[PDB]
Amino acid sequence: DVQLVESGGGLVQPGGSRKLSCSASGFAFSSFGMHWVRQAPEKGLEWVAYISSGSGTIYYADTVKGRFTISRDDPKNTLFLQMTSLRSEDTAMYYCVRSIYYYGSSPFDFWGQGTTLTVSSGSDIVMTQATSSVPVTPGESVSISCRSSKSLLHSNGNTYLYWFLQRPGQSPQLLIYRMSNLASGVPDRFSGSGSGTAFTLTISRLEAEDVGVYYCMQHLEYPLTFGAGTKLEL
Amino acid sequence: CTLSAEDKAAVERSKMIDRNLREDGEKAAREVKLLLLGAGESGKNTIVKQMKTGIVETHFTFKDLHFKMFDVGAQRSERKKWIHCFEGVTAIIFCVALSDYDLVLAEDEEMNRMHASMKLFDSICNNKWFTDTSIILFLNKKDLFEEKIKKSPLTICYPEYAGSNTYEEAAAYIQCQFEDLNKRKDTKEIYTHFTCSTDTKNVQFVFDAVTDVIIKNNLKDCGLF
Amino acid sequence: SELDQLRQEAEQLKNQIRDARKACADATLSQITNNIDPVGRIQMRTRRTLRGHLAKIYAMHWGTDSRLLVSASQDGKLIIWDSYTTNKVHAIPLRSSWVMTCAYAPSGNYVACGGLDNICSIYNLKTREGNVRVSRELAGHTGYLSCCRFLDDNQIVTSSGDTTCALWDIETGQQTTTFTGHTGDVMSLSLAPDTRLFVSGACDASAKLWDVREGMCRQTFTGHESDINAICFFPNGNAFATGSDDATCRLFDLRADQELMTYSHDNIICGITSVSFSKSGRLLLAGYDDFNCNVWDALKADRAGVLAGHDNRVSCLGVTDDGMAVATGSWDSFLKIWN
Amino acid sequence: DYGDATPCQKVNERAFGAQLLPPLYSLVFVIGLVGNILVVLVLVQYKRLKNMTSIYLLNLAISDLLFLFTLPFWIDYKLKDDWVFGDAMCKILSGFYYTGLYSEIFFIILLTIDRYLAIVHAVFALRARTVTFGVITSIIIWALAILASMPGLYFSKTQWEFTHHTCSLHFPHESLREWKLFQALKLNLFGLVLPLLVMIICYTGIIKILLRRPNEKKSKAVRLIFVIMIIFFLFWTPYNLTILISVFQDFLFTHECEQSRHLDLAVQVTEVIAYTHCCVNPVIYAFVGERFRKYLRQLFHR
Amino acid sequence: NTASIAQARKLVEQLKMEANIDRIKVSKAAADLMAYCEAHAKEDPLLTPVPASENPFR
Amino acid sequence: HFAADCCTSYISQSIPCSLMKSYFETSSECSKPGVIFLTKKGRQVCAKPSGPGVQDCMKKLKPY
Ligand SMILES: CC(C)CCC[C@@H](C)[C@H]1CC[C@H]2[C@@H]3CC=C4C[C@@H](O)CC[C@]4(C)[C@H]3CC[C@]12C
């Protein structure tokens, strides 16, 4: 089975250096590009670093640029993040994320368990989820919205919107990998639709396991920006 | 550059696929390809054993040179539909049994096995796909020939034979009769070896003949031909 | 002599069939399509060239989505191509490099290939591990595999040098139906649009319409003087075209059980490697040993166009399901998309 | 008072050379250029069939094209008896001339060693005759040609003779003899001794192999090899011998001005002799092969 | 040899089922194919090329 | 190689630079170096580059 297990997270003093590791099992590691995404105690997902298959392209977010290094060792199936000059803002739970790219592929389809890092003591697209929380009752249909700074529709015809579900105490799960494209192992109840800058996720015949925080992400250009997060209750 | 992030990642994947294809092609170009043909079962299996249900591939290495041998026995279909798949083979190893001149096909009684072997050789050698490829001919079971020629005359298969019934002239006559079927003598050579069930030098003979074929192809590439 | 009586019975039955066919031929296709406006000059142009195969290409098959291609070469490689951007989506190493046929499933989840190994290999394209794997190996033929075509993800039809065809259930690996009746090697298959019938052409210069569900031969068609290398259904399923070594393409009608039209030229003396129709069925595209492709007006039998641009034998053709493009593959190791 | 020493005017020899050198230079130019551009057009198109021999032959064609590019300017200088260009032009032409000469010779050496590896070490050549090594060795050879062309560029300059101009090398005073000796010997040892030695060794090996179990085609190839060596020797020895004599024309000649003018005429004639090898090369290394002619015919037919 | 008679029989019944087939005149099959080609003429990009704005391979 | 004019002998005494118009540094082609001179009457003159007064006055002559 596909498995990503992460290690190296612990309490650290400011200005120190820590190295995070992500062992990979059950898949061809070399083929997949790898991303590191972090969630702070505020619980908003933020993309940190990307290393491509073959190590050709490496991207970093502006906040961590120059202090964080991402490397992969393909023979041992391990992804590494080297962090230097650690700051209080850095404290977060870090996630190893699998992502493959070709015509018709499904990137961001598997996420690691995550590890906790504790530190003692203008052109980017902004993604706007207006509603923070929605009280729901099982059996009804629920619509979640995601407005975007700029149109996500490229000249190809693709709209680069991704929907994720994070259940309490679990890592995020991909639901819709491009606007209206449903992921594998995901019930047909979830549907996605939109145009240009306006987006919507529709859940029909809601069930108990759907309770969690729903995030919306753009993959049009780097850096990758997540939404604020919409919570479902009851 | 008017490409999405995922389009650029897709192009990067395509480029890595290209590098893998080029590496595989470079490895492929440096190996010898041998097509193993024989009328019925002459010495073919014994040859394979010494050098070590569709096409059977055999791999081996001799003196830093890599050989791939393809056996198309047990493919009882129209040959003219798949023979062009071996257009670029380095050489054709043809096995013919010397002791099988008096014997008969046992499927059709009138035809001798040696005449069937000669018909197959004539079809293969003068085939349009194999105009410029060379043939290594192995005349197998020579010792079993030695016991049979001194009682059974060779005239049973070759009535026009007018030599002595001893093995030197008989074997020379058979070799000459096979080589006389080559109707393209200015483009392809025929290398003939007399072997047995217990010989160690067959791989050496194949290595030397393949070295000559490679040298001839290099002469054609360098412009000395 | 019972054998003599059976032979004479067969001869008189064949005479009766020929007499009925002659009685059904009150007119020809040429005297009905006489008043049709001719197509004109078809001038298609190369829009894409697909490079990366390092040996002779033997087979290609379009995907149902009309973007994706699979092609098979004697490199021992299957390549899945994005035709719009020319990207290589997949490169599949083969266990045997002597491939002669390839097929792409209508769902897009599977690819099939095979050849001189006597085996049809079914490859899973969409796995959790992220690589293409061997889904199944279908064994049971004793001669080379010449053509394979999917009915769905679980059923596939193959033809062989056994002189037989076989319908397989992929899940169990077992041969579900065997189609016998040809006397020479079967070289090509084409499925009806409704997928309930086969046409197969063989080296005995005959084509046979088969019923998939019953496993028995519905009809037999003759008229070529040599081996039939290629066969294709008309878009409505009521006719099929065959291509042969004698340099002629022929149109056969299922309901009339006859031959309707012949496509030949005095300057064409080479065999035909492949045939295909356009969406409307008006154009018949055939690849030749003259290193090129001809476009025939299927109702006039006139030559409407030529596709030149291959330095070797045009081995394989395809038209997309929506009819935008043609793909040609040849022994010069190149694929070309034409509009 | 100066009525004791007077220079002799080589106006007769210049006038004679203006009438003999250009009419041969034009034919050399047209033949060499057409041959070499044809070779380049043929070699560039077959991308797949590219091997190390194709790289070396392409670079040989480029070297010949550079050297034939210097020719029109020299033709003009001979015709008009004056230099109508700048000092930078003299330096660039000298650099181009010596670069073409030395790169031509070195790429002939590379082609010969390629042939030796392909024929005598055919099995070993499978792992060695790769396009990457061809490109690298081409880079080193071009670097060596540029490095050997440095003195021409550094010293050459234009200066004024009494209603006309001259491009000349103008080596430093009191040291003409030593630098002329250096340049003549670099030309001699890298033009004759090394190329001839390589040809003798490599073609001895090749002919030794071709003559075991001989055929008609192998005999024809041996004949062609002998032709190649003879053409190289007879086309390049005259020029080098005349240059080496011209370096020491003071001591060798008992008299001067009646004989070194004869030497000058010899220098101009062997210049053309050595110049024509740029015309001979496409025939020797490209036209004789069957694949090259066949692909050329395909070029005509396409 | 009974195998020859068995093969001859199998051929006889095969021709028997092939003989009892309802056939239509060619003048109607040709009309049907001609009508099909006329009905779908405008849907054929290879026969009536589409403007470059609608060509995915432009 | 263009067979440039060059001297075969040199003057034994210093050349009076006053009886001059122009100067030339001899090309490298000839065996031995020299410096061509042109006098008032126009018959050519030369001596060694390292001669008595050739370098003393050669600057004094200009193409003007
Ligand atoms: C006198 C000066 C300007 C000469 C400059 C020559 C250099 C800069 C140029 C001229 C000839 C050129 C070579 C011509 C062809 C080949 C073969 C090709 O497959 C690799 C590059 C290579 C090797 C080129 C590299 C660049 C090159 C070496």
Numbering used by the authors:
A (entry chain S): 1 to 121, 135 to 247
B (entry chain A): 3 to 54, 182 to 354
C (entry chain B): 2 to 340
D (entry chain R): 17 to 318
E (entry chain G): 5 to 62
F (entry chain L): 27 to 90
Recite the paper's sentences:
CCR1 is widely expressed in various immune cells, and the knockdown of CCR1 has proved effective in suppressing the maturation and migration of immune cells, thus being regarded as an attractive drug target for the treatment of many autoimmune and allergic diseases, such as asthma. CCL15 is an endogenous ligand of CCR1 at which the N-terminal signal peptide is cleaved up on its secretion to extracellular media. In this work, we identified and characterized different N-terminal truncations of endogenous chemokine CCL15 as balanced or biased agonists targeting CCR1, and presented three cryogenic-electron microscopy structures of the CCR1–Gi complex in the ligand-free form or bound to different CCL15 truncations with a resolution of 2.6–2.9 Å, illustrating the structural basis of natural biased signaling that initiates an inflammation response.
Therefore, we grouped these N-terminal truncations of CCL15 into three categories: (1) CCL15 (26–92), which was a long form CCL15 (CCL15L) and showed a bias toward β-arrestin pathway; (2) CCL15 (27–92), which was a medium form CCL15 (CCL15M) and displayed balanced activation between G protein and β-arrestin pathways and (3) CCL15 truncations from (28–92) to (31–92), which were short forms of CCL15 (CCL15S) and were the strong G protein-biased agonists of CCR1. At the CRS1, the N terminus of CCR1 (residue D17YGDATPCQK26) ran parallel with the N-loop region of CCL15L and fitted onto the groove formed by the N-loop and β3 strands of CCL15L, corresponding to a surface buried area of 745 Å2 (740.4 Å2 in CCL15M–CCR1). The buried surface areas of the CRS3 of CCR1 (700 Å2 in CCL15L–CCR1 and 748.2 Å2 in CCL15M–CCR1, respectively) were comparable to the corresponding area in the CCL55P7–CCR5 complex (698.5 Å2), far more significant than that in other chemokine receptor structures including the CXCL8–CXCR2 (300 Å2) and CCL20-CCR6 (448 Å2) complexes.
